[PDB]
Amino acid sequence: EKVRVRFAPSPTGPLHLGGVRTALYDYLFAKHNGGDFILRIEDTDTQRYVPGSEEYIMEALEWIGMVPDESPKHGGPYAPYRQSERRDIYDRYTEQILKTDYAYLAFDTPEELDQIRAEFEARGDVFAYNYETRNRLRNSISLPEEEVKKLLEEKTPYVIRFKMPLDRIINLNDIIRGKFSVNTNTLDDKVLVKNDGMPTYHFANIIDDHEMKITHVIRGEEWLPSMALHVLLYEAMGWDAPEFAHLSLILKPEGKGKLSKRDGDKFGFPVFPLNFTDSATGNTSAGYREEGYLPEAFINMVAMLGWSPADNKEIVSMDEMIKEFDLNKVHKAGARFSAEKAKWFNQQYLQLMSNEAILPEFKKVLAENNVEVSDEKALKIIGLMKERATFVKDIYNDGKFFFHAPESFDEKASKKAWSPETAVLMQELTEAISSLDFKAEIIKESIHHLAEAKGLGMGKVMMPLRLSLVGELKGPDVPDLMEMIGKEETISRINKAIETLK
């Protein structure tokens, strides 16, 4: 039995982190076992359809590097991979289940069901269509066969419901959650086929998991209360159920409850892998991608929300995750999201990149800001800035003094770094460096020689010099800054500082 898993999102909007993590654990489990990773688009509910969802899903999976072996876009041996295109399949299996005792016809109109729901509510009760109520309602169990024929002949709309067994203990086994039991008298007669012949999610999914030879169903815990019904649908069809693994919801950074988009808005962190623009507002929610997260760092971060790399390394690549991943070690306890941790991962991955690997994106940033520098200087600037960077764009945004002279000087910094003797000192410094081979270490030695001839610590020259070149006391070491911007730009900035601050 070749392992086969499917990511089965409905097209109802952008992928949340929980959905990315489910797709990832699908992919890892499949690849770890030499099996197949299927994408099935679960679009049976036409009214909940969100335009652009399916494109977003393909694009996010491609960005992260987990392309489905089978999908609507790519094809595969169980095409069509959109459920809206599988109606003939569901039609034939509907006929099959109606030959059993597990399904029946229900003619109740939505107004009739609204009425009985309101009667229960008024009493403090919740109406369920189940073993206790089905005999007072309008269906093929409660109505004589000749009346059912009459209704059918008149084209009376109906749904198909599952007939829950009476008082039956269903013993279930989940890879994550372990063993537990459900009595069917807690469950209702769920709708399996809507009144247009389209299956509901529950029926379409056991039909398609059976037809697509799925061996392991990995999904979120919101589906756990449905597992008993799904096992009983396999039983009704004469089929063996796959194995199940239910993932606990990602928790808020702080306080009780699940992570939501409202948290990311409220605290300033992205919630979707890629940009997405809401139709109903025109608003665009920026993705991790567009904010500068590397996909390798993003997916490493998502992987850790419930899985501990068996080798104890925090930093792990896609291919090492494939080799290491054990679905049996995925934790049942919920994992808290951490925006700081996501930034930490990006910073860690950025340090592991060579200056050359950063250089293409750095040049794109430089171009967007209308600046140019030689490849050789850009690589040195990347080297000098990358340790303190989280995103490639930080190398420019926090390093603007490499490309732009200061137009003013921070008042606090000026009081600290610039004294009534500083002007004369900086002009002497200009005279010293004007004849140098303008290399960092040579510059540093020349500054040291001026300091010791004047009886000063290094800081007495370096601090006003940094202020002169940067406009505040930020940046990397002054001699390397000077080498990058060059002799002419260095002197020109010392001159402007003298003219401004003496």
Ligand SMILES: N[C@@H](CCC(=O)O)C(=O)O
């Ligand atoms: N369409 C369902 C699929 C659940 C499953 O994997 O069975 C969802 O979006 O959650």
